[PDB]
Amino acid sequence: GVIRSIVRAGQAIPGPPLGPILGQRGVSINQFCKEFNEKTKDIKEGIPLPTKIFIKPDRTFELKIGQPTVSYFLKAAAGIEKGARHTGKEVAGLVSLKHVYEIACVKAKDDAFAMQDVPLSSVVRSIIGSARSLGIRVVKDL
Amino acid sequence: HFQRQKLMAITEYIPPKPAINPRCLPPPPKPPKEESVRLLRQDIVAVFRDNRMIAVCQNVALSAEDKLLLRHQLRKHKIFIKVFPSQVLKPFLENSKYRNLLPLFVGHNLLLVSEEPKVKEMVRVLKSVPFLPLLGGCVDDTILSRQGLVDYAK
Amino acid sequence: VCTDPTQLTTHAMGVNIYKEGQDVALKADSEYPTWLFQVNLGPPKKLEELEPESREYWRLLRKQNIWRHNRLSKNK
Amino acid sequence: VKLVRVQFCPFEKNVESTRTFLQTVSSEKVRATNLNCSVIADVREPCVDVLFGDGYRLIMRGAHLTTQEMLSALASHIRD
Amino acid sequence: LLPVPTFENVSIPERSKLKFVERVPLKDIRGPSTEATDFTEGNFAILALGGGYLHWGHFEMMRLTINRFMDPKNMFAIWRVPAPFKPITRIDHYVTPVKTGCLVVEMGGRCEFEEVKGILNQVAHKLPFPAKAVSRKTLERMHQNQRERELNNQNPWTFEHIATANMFGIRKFLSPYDLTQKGRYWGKFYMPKRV
Amino acid sequence: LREVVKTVIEGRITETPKATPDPPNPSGQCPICRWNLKHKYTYEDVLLLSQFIRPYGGMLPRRVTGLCREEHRKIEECVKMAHRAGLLPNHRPQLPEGCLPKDKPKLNRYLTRWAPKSVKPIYKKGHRWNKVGMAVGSPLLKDNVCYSRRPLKMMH
Ligand code: FES
């Protein structure tokens, strides 16, 4: 069973958001954190990571992780930790072309998140759309 | 009053009766056909014209993600997984280079479209999934069996 | 981390954030392929912007068709 | 059902019923349900053979049998 | 497929909600509707099929139900009738007389008829008189159906010919108003199927 | 028409009876339209009805017959009337394994719109203007040709 979470690598035992939710199906919580901690060492600590854990009926762990979220990076790039109430029109940061493109080039390395499209148009739309989801406007130049 | 009621009954509207009911009507003409779907024609026309030999194999209950992975796998084989809704596939022969390949494209089946006669790469694709059945390969856009495909491929 | 607009606009600060990945400098615009900076930077392609004979045109139109059904479904 | 064998000739006249029946058997959900089954498809009139450990062998030809008849017959056998 | 309809041109007034109706202010209802028979702003409304008396509770039922369910972003509502003024002695309540074919409430905005059919029908059922939810397209179809049945009538004898010709001395047993109704209106009720 | 012989089984496609050539009205969308039989058949016309019924009295699928829905309802209603009247001795319901009839007498009925099982008795008949009506015939057969001066009394 696929369970998607965005928990940060820095903390390997968030508690309710992972521990019992994975535990409810029936798993070893300690085992989950140890492998997540293994991911934490490889990756920078304190940055959210999408996970695609599959909880099979055999009570086994199939942990798959990818690049850190561009959404949080856009929030960090805009210097925003907690956004506006709505964020539909509220904006606190503007991102230019060069910053947008640089991250996209590195982004196209994971078998997950469908980062295999030859054209970069697909890549930009997700981050552009992600910025729309966040309180960020992606202006061409400022 | 009763007398006024009599007037109303006589004045009641009388509906005419059609000669023949719509279901039991004689065969009437129908409007000319219109191609809505037209976009999909261009995509399939390009891929089939580009690729002379097409290997037609029935599609097992595969996942969308795997198809992209298999699409990349064929890129190593120099083949492309380009597929589209099959309800527009049948009219392909109506407006395309050929009109006689309809029987080959029967049902929902994976299409391996290759422009080059790299037999080994095509055979390797067959080796990827044994349970999946390969209907055959229309080498040089000529209808042939799976066994014939290998024989001509040799 | 970088705190200079000139460095921000002349060096790829956000390309890599790990400790294993060190901030790399920006190459010239010509040093990258043309398609890199020719990507669609405008607003989402609307039905007018989309080419009627393109998959994205119908793909987004199908998305719009779902919206009306969802709008009707939401009211139920 | 330990094994299910489906054979049909696509190049020659191919019956839709047997081909459609193959799709139902070759499904991610159907295969998981009858996990014991080993799915083998023969591609080259059509003959479908299913082998059971108890020795019950059920052979179905789709030339004059629809997929529903095979599915109806198979479904009862699987329950055992 | 074909392009989906759009309501961009439609403009929603600021006063989306319905205004309050006062509790307190002879053939008013025994005749055909002469006012509010045409759609003014919205494309949907409620059409009176009978002569009834609308008390304050009915107005609140229309006002409260419409306001709670309507969407100010895409919908607006207006009042097509005056407040109750006719006393009902026990005075228990006052009512607004309505004539057959009067539009009582008109709603518009960026919405389809099907969206408002359920609420309008519920309001119509709660109304003191028989009523049917109507729209610009549906109302015209009713008239078009009304015209078609009238045009193709195969009856050799018609109400107007007998009444106007005073055959059998029928006018002795008919009221002066009946000539105008032509058999489509009886008392305070209107017969839609009378053609 | 396919029949299955039965594990190893074999299905044989057998010859099916063919419609008589030269319909009186060729090009009719439905067979009744083809044969000009729209308003000339009744429940007593078992010969026509039997062709569209299962061997045990079940209704055949409309798609196989190809007739229009209007005739489908009329034919089904006519067949229903025949069964309740005991006019189809060879299409009686199949007894599953070893069941036998209750052996009680069967009341002779005809022109039965509804099943006698689910019809309650009428205790209060009513007066002249309050008399209760007893349904006779079926509404589906109103359009049938009538040879009487006045329309038939559906309610008795
Ligand atoms: S008689 Fe022609 S469709 Fe029924």
Side-chain angles (χ1 to χ4, degrees), chain C residues 13 26 28 31 41 49 52 66 68 70-71 74-75:
Chain C
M13 316 309 318
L26 278 175
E31 284 184 52
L41 294 150
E49 285 172 288
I66 296 154
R68 55 183 292 283
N70 270 14
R71 275 200 323 277
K74 188 267 185 182
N75 289 316

Side-chain angles (χ1 to χ4, degrees), chain E residues 56-180:
Chain E
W56 176 82
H58 285 312
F59 281 98
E60 287 311 287
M61 172 267 301
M62 290 190 282
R63 191 181 69 84
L64 295 170
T65 311
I66 290 165
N67 292 358
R68 171 164 63 259
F69 153 84
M70 73 162 284
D71 181 13
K73 300 158 195 172
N74 300 313
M75 297 172 164
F76 72 85
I78 66 179
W79 285 108
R80 303 293 303 280
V81 288
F85 57 85
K86 174 200 193 78
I88 312 301
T89 189
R90 168 66 82 194
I91 306 167
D92 180 9
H93 59 282
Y94 298 76
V95 295
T96 310
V98 174
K99 267 195 194 292
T100 64
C102 289
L103 298 181
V104 182
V105 171
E106 175 161 39
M107 287 179 62
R110 308 181 171 84
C111 56
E112 292 274 336
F113 193 34
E114 175 205 349
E115 299 182 353
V116 299
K117 278 192 228 212
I119 294 295
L120 293 176
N121 292 333
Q122 162 273 322
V123 162
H125 162 88
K126 281 197 177 186
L127 283 187
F129 51 89
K132 159 157 51 161
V134 289
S135 70
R136 288 171 180 279
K137 57 182 82 166
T138 49
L139 181 56
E140 184 49 37
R141 288 170 203 172
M142 223 175 299
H143 303 304
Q144 288 168 343
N145 296 334
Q146 181 60 25
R147 289 179 186 95
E148 183 268 333
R149 277 143 71 90
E150 292 156 348
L151 290 167
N152 65 7
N153 175 24
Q154 299 308 296
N155 199 339
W157 295 104
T158 70
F159 182 101
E160 195 67 5
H161 297 137
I162 289 165
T164 57
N166 193 40
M167 309 184 82
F168 269 81
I170 190 68
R171 301 176 95 149
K172 172 174 167 180
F173 311 103
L174 287 172
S175 175
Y177 291 96
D178 279 333
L179 307 162
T180 69

Side-chain angles (χ1 to χ4, degrees), chain F residues 39 41-44 81 110-111 113 134-156:
Chain F
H39 305 301
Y41 63 81
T42 53
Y43 86 96
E44 294 181 7
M81 297 166 54
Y110 49 94
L111 302 173
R113 174 183 306 181
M134 302 174 67
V136 175
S138 167
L140 287 176
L141 301 189
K142 273 174 202 145
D143 52 8
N144 297 2
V145 66
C146 173
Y147 293 98
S148 162
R149 200 187 59 74
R150 203 157 59 74
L152 312 183
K153 283 302 193 193
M154 301 306 276
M155 309 282 291
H156 274 201

Side-chain angles (χ1 to χ4, degrees), chain B residues 23-24, chain F residues 29-30 32-33 38 68 71:
Chain B
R23 300 173 191 169
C24 313
Chain F
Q29 291 265 330
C30 62
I32 301 299
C33 175
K38 188 80 176 303
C68 52
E71 299 321 285

Side-chain angles (χ1 to χ4, degrees), chain D residues 2-68:
Chain D
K2 265 62 68 182
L3 305 98
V4 55
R5 191 269 290 164
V6 291
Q7 171 270 308
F8 69 109
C9 294
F11 177 68
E12 296 176 354
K13 188 264 286 180
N14 47 354
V15 179
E16 195 62 27
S17 299
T18 194
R19 201 175 150 284
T20 54
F21 166 86
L22 183 154
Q23 196 62 241
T24 61
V25 175
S26 306
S27 160
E28 292 161 300
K29 280 68 65 178
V30 176
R31 283 179 275 117
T33 289
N34 58 8
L35 196 145
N36 57 4
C37 77
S38 80
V39 67
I40 188 78
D42 285 328
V43 72
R44 295 192 288 112
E45 191 275 326
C47 179
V48 170
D49 171 72
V50 74
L51 285 180
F52 296 169
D54 290 345
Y56 302 166
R57 79 296 187 268
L58 189 73
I59 295 91
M60 296 277 166
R61 281 90 67 199
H64 315 293
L65 279 296
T66 190
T67 182
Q68 305 305 322

